[PDB]
Design a protein around this ligand. Sequence first.
Ligand SMILES: *C(=O)/C=C/N[C@@H](C(=O)O)C(C)(C)S(=O)O
Ligand SMILES: *C(=O)/C=C/N[C@@H](C(=O)O)C(C)(C)S(=O)O
Ligand SMILES: *C(=O)/C=C/N[C@@H](C(=O)O)C(C)(C)S(=O)O
Ligand SMILES: *C(=O)/C=C/N[C@@H](C(=O)O)C(C)(C)S(=O)O
Lengths: 265, 265, 265, 265
Amino acid sequence: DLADRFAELERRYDARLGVYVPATGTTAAIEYRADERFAFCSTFKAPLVAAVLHQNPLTHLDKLITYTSDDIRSISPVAQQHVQTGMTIGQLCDAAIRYSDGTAANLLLADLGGPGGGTAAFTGYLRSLGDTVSRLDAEEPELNRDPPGDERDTTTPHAIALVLQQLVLGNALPPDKRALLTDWMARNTTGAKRIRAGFPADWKVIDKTGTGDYGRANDIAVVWSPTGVPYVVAVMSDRAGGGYDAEPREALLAEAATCVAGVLA
Amino acid sequence: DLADRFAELERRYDARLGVYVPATGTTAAIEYRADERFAFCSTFKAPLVAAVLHQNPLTHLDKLITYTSDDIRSISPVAQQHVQTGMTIGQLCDAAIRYSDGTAANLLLADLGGPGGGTAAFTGYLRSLGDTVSRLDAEEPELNRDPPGDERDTTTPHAIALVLQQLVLGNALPPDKRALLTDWMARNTTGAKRIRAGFPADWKVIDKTGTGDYGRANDIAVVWSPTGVPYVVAVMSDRAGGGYDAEPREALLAEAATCVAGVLA
Amino acid sequence: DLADRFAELERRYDARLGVYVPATGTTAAIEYRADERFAFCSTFKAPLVAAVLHQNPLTHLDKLITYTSDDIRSISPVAQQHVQTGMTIGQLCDAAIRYSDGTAANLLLADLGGPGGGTAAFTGYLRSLGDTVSRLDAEEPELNRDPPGDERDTTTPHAIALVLQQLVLGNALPPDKRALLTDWMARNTTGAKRIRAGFPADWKVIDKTGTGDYGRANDIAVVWSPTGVPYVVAVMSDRAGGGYDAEPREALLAEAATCVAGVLA
Amino acid sequence: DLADRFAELERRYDARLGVYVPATGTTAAIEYRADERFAFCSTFKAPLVAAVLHQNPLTHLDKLITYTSDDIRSISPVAQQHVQTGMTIGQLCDAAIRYSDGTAANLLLADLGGPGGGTAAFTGYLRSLGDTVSRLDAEEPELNRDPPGDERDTTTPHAIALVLQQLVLGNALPPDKRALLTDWMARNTTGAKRIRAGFPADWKVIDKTGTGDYGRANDIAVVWSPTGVPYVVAVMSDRAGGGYDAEPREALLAEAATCVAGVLA
Ligand SMILES: *C(=O)/C=C/N[C@@H](C(=O)O)C(C)(C)S(=O)O
Ligand SMILES: *C(=O)/C=C/N[C@@H](C(=O)O)C(C)(C)S(=O)O
Ligand SMILES: *C(=O)/C=C/N[C@@H](C(=O)O)C(C)(C)S(=O)O
Ligand SMILES: *C(=O)/C=C/N[C@@H](C(=O)O)C(C)(C)S(=O)O
């Protein structure tokens, strides 16, 4: 019957919608189009940081990286301002998470090295976490104007949940680094209207958003109940029907979170 | 399956639980022990104010009412301070709602007049709103130490919902007065951890709480969705199992509200 | 010329206003009626907690304290709810700071012992910190209806600043305890509209408010610049002119903080 | 007093600093190097939009403009992506304000027509608003890399304030258009750490930034007090001392705004 409540939101908001919450000690998993493909958008920036955290020691975040005016092809609210000054890996990661800065993302991919501009290195990282399905070829901005049906630059709710789970809750990173990533996500600016707004205030929520064309809108998060019980929530949507220029509806993502909060409480 | 989620909370929290939300233009009502009797506790102070608003002109709120130090039997954080000075009907109502002042309650019942200390007059008022089941017999504090099963000083979730609906949303009161009551409930101090904490912040919530012995804990509220859709939510509980001195669990009330928010979103 | 800006606010808001910030390594202090007496209101609850932290070991916070329904004479949003269950010293302190609970305050004074209900014990504590001027005689609620000119239950901005400085920044408490107090103040609920609202968001602010009759309104705080430079800010006001029933203006407190932020930046 | 506080910031940050706030119904203006020349940087994009709003009817914003890959000389986060699709005047203006897109800027100058690439047409527009000092000669990127002392592509705080005032507050534009421009500025992405960060959150702020070599960093804004009183704030800086390669300090701009907020409150 929760299936039917998601299908309702789908109809109201004129969108296809994908939801995954893994199982726990107590609870059974929650599936809805969980094994269908969706566009990543900016959601892959979460693991990306983790990949950079994984590859290098912890003092590596101090390395300053320089770049040019014509390195800014994507929207980049932080990179734009620090062309003269440059930016350290540390600041790059902060921005990529907290502000969804597109340029930084690309710089960090380059920090991974390897062909594809570091997209292979990163693809490789996901496999280390047992992620077969997710696939990534292009960078920002080009990847977020790929057409519907195209399986390049895509993932499933099921998949990305299990990644985020291993990173945050699992032992995929040392505690010190893990800490950093949570801290960053805990302070995301771009996610107020989506998963955060669907949960009660007494729940703790850390999230990473994704947006694009064809009404594409995603949010992946870890939440803690008022008694500190952790849960992973992958929410993904699109509106490929209204074409390229369709607007995403955060309201959709907020409403679903509320249904989910209901079963989890 | 929502039936099964309430029965779960019941088992977790070792409590009996009553829930009612009336039907709307779209949605069907939500019932769970909705037609079972529970203790009012301090929840009856909401209609009580309405009864005093209903019976008298609007300038009647300026009438000063004096009382003694030994008129303070219940918890009365506001009555305590204004013993020498007295208090106007207006300020009495504010206190009764916003602070759940027990003395004021009794003063207002006396303002209704009639035997029972004004409990019959008040019982009479509810019938004017088509409320058959509800009964009120004693005053504060004595009423909050009635034993389980005793039908004096009781109501059903179903009933009190339909009252609150008529008062707040319906035309049971002139707009000016209606306004006052909503304003007061909007500014309740005593309700943070119950219904308010079960809904997302982007919902508007006005509530009136109740507490007592045998783990008795109630909260009735009107909520607005993020798009201004109103709903009435009656939640009532008790824990007569652990006897007189069983502690109430607000956690229970907050958790249920969350399940409810889930179906309403 | 900052003198003239405070006198302006005074005239606009029809209020007397007291401001103190101590001197630092760099900066000179800020004075305006800093050595004039004002009512404490709920501001004394900050040191009060410190006095209880000072007097007893750290394990003492687990001692559960019981009380009756008629022990709630003041407004007490948390004491209200935990009459059946009781409350530990630890929880009492949290409430007294975070919610300005009036009852708890009085219970804690009783924990200090001595005549005056523990007001002498507490008065004694301030002298240990070299505070000459500050005086405390009555408890809640009686102290909040002292008339203007009455020097009982009063302090100066200068004084209370130097206390708060020693507690938070100075070595007046062991680090562990100090930590607790800061944590509590960092999470004050009652202070959003006063000092907090006069500083830019990139400043860190921890505060403790006070309100009462005769438009009495205070806020004492520690702030950190965006680069972690600490400062102590005492702000106090009243409007004894419009009599007992004069309303306090938080706007006044927020405006002054802004003038202060200006010199500190 | 305040003169000396600006000279301090100057010394701290190793920079020359220009500040202007016009006079109001109440307050006297604020001058500090207000009549000295500074580089525009990207600040001129504000009036530029206004000039295009002024010259043409309101439906002109729908005219699509196409361009080539080799038309993208400057930083252009939006122009980069819409080479295939093209962009309407409407979208061009949004970008120029909200994202400080450098290409769009140049396209719009071309929309004005005339020699200099439309820089004379634009220079001409400012004179219509009674602005004598301001001049513009080159386009992006070339204009941001021309040396200190060179009076081409420059303005004074005094001047640009009086322009922004007339546009936003004054009757320089019809309400409908005026509305558009404010809306755009209200939604600037590039300005978080400058003027916006120096004011308290309860102030409303709309801004337009500028950055360049020789530590050049500007922000012009309209602010509303918490009670809706409007003010215009021009802040400009540079660090020609450390030569071409000197890094700009937004911190400087944020600090000054704080001093200004202080006098305005
Ligand atoms: C991540 O969610 C995407 C970042 N930004 C894009 C979006 O649609 O939100 C763009 C297209 C603005 S970016 O220039 O690629
Ligand atoms: C409203 O919920 C009831 C308040 N009653 C109190 C009273 O003093 O009458 C108590 C203490 C009996 S109950 O614990 O709320
Ligand atoms: C802090 O001590 C202020 C207390 N005074 C008032 C308040 O704001 O709580 C009263 C007078 C309402 S107190 O609770 O009696
Ligand atoms: C406007 O001030 C922005 C101009 N863009 C850049 C350019 O390449 O011209 C800079 C370097 C001046 S700015 O640092 O973003």
